[PDB]
Every structure is written in structure tokens, then in C-alpha cells.
Amino acid sequence: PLHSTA
Amino acid sequence: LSDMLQQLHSVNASKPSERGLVRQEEAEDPACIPIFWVSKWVDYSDKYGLGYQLCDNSVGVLFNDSTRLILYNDGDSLQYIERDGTESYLTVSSHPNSLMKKITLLKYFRNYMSEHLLKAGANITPLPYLRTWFRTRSAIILHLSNGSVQINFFQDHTKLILCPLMAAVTYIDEKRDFRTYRLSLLEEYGCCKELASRLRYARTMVDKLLSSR
Structure with a gap:
């Protein structure tokens, strides 16, 4: 649902 | 602190x-x-927990049950930390059946991070x-x-x-x-x-x- 920079 | x-x-x-x-x-x-x-990190705590990659390419997960799984950068060496702080050293290739779900989750999180996320401090010279x-x-x-x-x-x-x-x-x-x-x-x-x-x-x-x- 959220993560570090792609 | x-x-x-x-x-x-x-x-x-x-x-x-x-x-x-x-x-x-x-x-x-x-x-x-x-x-x-x-x-790198992934917030999947609504279901499983929070996964992360350290700068050395080792990976970790803090699960929702307050246990931790740590995969070293060799890709097999494992550390497991229970709720009471009991630390266990093993490998993926030698895991007990009980850790099956958690190992699968780590490997899934590991793959996403490695393939789809940017490495922070990738330009910095190189548990x-x-x-x-x-x-x-x-x-x-x-x-x-x-x-x-x-x-x-x-x-x-x-x-x-x-x-x-x-x-x-x-x-x-x-x-x-x-x-x-x-x-x-x-x-x-x-x-x-x-x-x-x-x-x-x-x-x-x-x-x-x-x-x-």
C-alpha cells in the first residue's frame, strides 16, 4: 500500500 | 537514543x-x-508487516506479531528473532516447516524491492x-x-x-x-x-x- 521511491 | x-x-x-x-x-x-x-522499504503492515533492504543488499522484515526475519546478502543465511528476543541463526535452505509462511513473505518482499524500488545511497561507497x-x-x-x-x-x-x-x-x-x-x-x-x-x-x-x- 506504500513503499520507498520507485 | x-x-x-x-x-x-x-x-x-x-x-x-x-x-x-x-x-x-x-x-x-x-x-x-x-x-x-x-x-528500500515496503509498508505492508495492514496484513503482514514492514519489509526493508539495508545498503548491503541484506533484507529484513518486522512482522505484525513483533517477530523479525533477516536474510543476509548471500541469499541463504537467515536470522530469526522471536517476540521475547530469542535470536536464531539458520538458513532458508534449512528452515523448520513452521517458518514457511514467513520465509515466503520475505522472498516476495525481497523480489519486489530488488526489482521495482530505487536503492537509497546508491552512490555512497560501500548486522x-x-x-x-x-x-x-x-x-x-x-x-x-x-x-x-x-x-x-x-x-x-x-x-x-x-x-x-x-x-x-x-x-x-x-x-x-x-x-x-x-x-x-x-x-x-x-x-x-x-x-x-x-x-x-x-x-x-x-x-x-x-x-x-
């Missing part, structure tokens, strides 16, 4: 950005470059685990077991890595340039408003960590 809070109070009280000639370059201490930081973490509207705050505290700002992608043992801070700016400072030297020579503002936030975040352990 207590010493980190004190180091930050000391630098912040010196008002580094607002007392004359700023000599920030002279506060750089390349000797204090951290060995470990968080390069702790995640003790705790929380998220604000502005930033994710990561507390490692070696005492380091990392703060990643969402909006501008700027990052701080705070190292209490060196009494130092590494700052990664919007251009992904990294500079490592000794905190007392920032007190001695000052710094720009940008770094000064994030350090004031950092102190507030450490205070939140200390008040919620």
Missing part, C-alpha cells in the same frame, strides 16, 4: 543557520560515513535489524538495533541518517548528493536552513521514539 536526543538538542540550541558565516563544508566528517542504512518504525504525513522514521535512526522525507525525497556512536548525521538532499557531518562541528561552523530545519524535526522524531518504546 538518549544520547542522540542530547546531541540534537546541543546542535539545535546553537541555532546553526542563524548566527553569521555558515561554514558547512568544514563540518563534514567523511570518517563518520555510516556502514548501515535503509536503502543490525529494525527495532521499530513509524510513519507521519511528512516522513517515515526507522530505528535500527545499532542505535541509528533514519528519517526519509516523502515529498522532497531528502533523508537523514543519524549515528549516535559517531555523534554524526548523513544528509541526502534532493539531488541525491550525500554529506556526512559531525554534529558538534555543525555547532562549530553552522549549516544552511534546509539541514537546520530537518534536524529540528529529527529531534522531535527522536522524542517520539523515546516516548513510545
